Design a protein around this ligand. Sequence first.
Ligand SMILES: *[C@@H]1O[C@H](CO[C@H]2O[C@@H](C)[C@@H](O)[C@@H](O)[C@@H]2O)[C@@H](O)[C@H](O)[C@H]1NC(C)=O
Ligand SMILES: *[C@@H]1O[C@H](CO)[C@@H](O)[C@H](O)[C@H]1NC(C)=O
Lengths: 8, 274, 99
Amino acid sequence: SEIEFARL
Amino acid sequence: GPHSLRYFVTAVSRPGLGEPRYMEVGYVDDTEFVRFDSDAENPRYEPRARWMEQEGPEYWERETQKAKGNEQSFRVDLRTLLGYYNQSKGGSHTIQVISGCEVGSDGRLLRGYQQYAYDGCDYIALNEDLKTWTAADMAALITKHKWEQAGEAERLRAYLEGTCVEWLRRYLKNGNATLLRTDSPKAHVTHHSRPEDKVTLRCWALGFYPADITLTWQLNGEELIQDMELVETRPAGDGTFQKWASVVVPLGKEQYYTCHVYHQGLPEPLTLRW
Amino acid sequence: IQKTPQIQVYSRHPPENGKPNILNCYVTQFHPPHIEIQMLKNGKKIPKVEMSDMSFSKDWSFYILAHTEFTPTETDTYACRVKHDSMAEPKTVYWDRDM
Ligand SMILES: *[C@@H]1O[C@H](CO[C@H]2O[C@@H](C)[C@@H](O)[C@@H](O)[C@@H]2O)[C@@H](O)[C@H](O)[C@H]1NC(C)=O
Ligand SMILES: *[C@@H]1O[C@H](CO)[C@@H](O)[C@H](O)[C@H]1NC(C)=O
């Protein structure tokens, strides 16, 4: 399962 | 042998045409197994490999919600980068991400990764140590500083060493009949005349899996990797791959050239001639 | 970064008239991602086309596969037509079963 991405 | 879990993520803005298109495509080794496309009639995370039917409805609901969350968050990223790069609000831009982990035959972590690109160029990437980042420009340096202060590296590392590895092991277990199989290449050589008494010999390798394979042309036990033309290995529409490599030889001397095929499915490499 | 898509057209099995097969149009090495891909039978658009295997290479260029089931005959011709910002006019590549 995919990870929750953080903001750039 | 080793196996991998990879997610290819893409967010593309389109000023004047609505919200950015957001897509997620997941692969276990060379096999597409899940997908999310915000442009679909009703965007949902969907299985792309038969063995994913083994996951209950909770999985699909959770992955779908996670994807929608990532989508909205990437909408923010696209706007943020316009500020970092001082770009117009009317142009189309692209954010790409490759995220995943790789394990050995024993199921232990071999390596993890997470790399971003903006408009086709390196932006930021997690280093092999899974502790620090490498920024390609000053814009990415801003992100790097933000992530360092947020402890993002630690969070990502917990995901790569835990969650990522654990699900990959589970996917390999559930789809073992598909993922651990080996389809042996079937090869043949084609002949094409060329002006100046020259001939094009093309060696084809079909129906194999996994995708890794070696195709070479030989002359007197010598590899002609130099004057050899070929295509990147490619999917054939049914979960298998194909490839071809050609060489230009003098007419009448075709029987001196041999094609060699090496693959996990060939206990003995193949050797063909026209 | 703008890259012209490479267009490759091929079948899963060596073509045999009357025998079910799969026709593929692999569009690769392009950027930006916006692109239009259509498969054609005798100049007419094929309706049952599946898009799959989307990914990017080390240099971030996009890759994607369009494929469909088909039964080749001696007279039927197939092609793949692609429209991309890197090209002024749509590009059509014809299937060469003798390659
Ligand atoms: C594949 O594994 C088979 C047993 O594992 C299956 O049953 C459960 C453990 C569940 O996780 C399923 O998803 C697994 O696939 C075994 O009988 C087969 O011999 C193995 N190989 C093939 C080709 O099926
Ligand atoms: C940003 O906006 C415009 C376009 O380049 C210009 O007025 C200005 O100099 C640019 N650069 C910065 C940092 O403002």
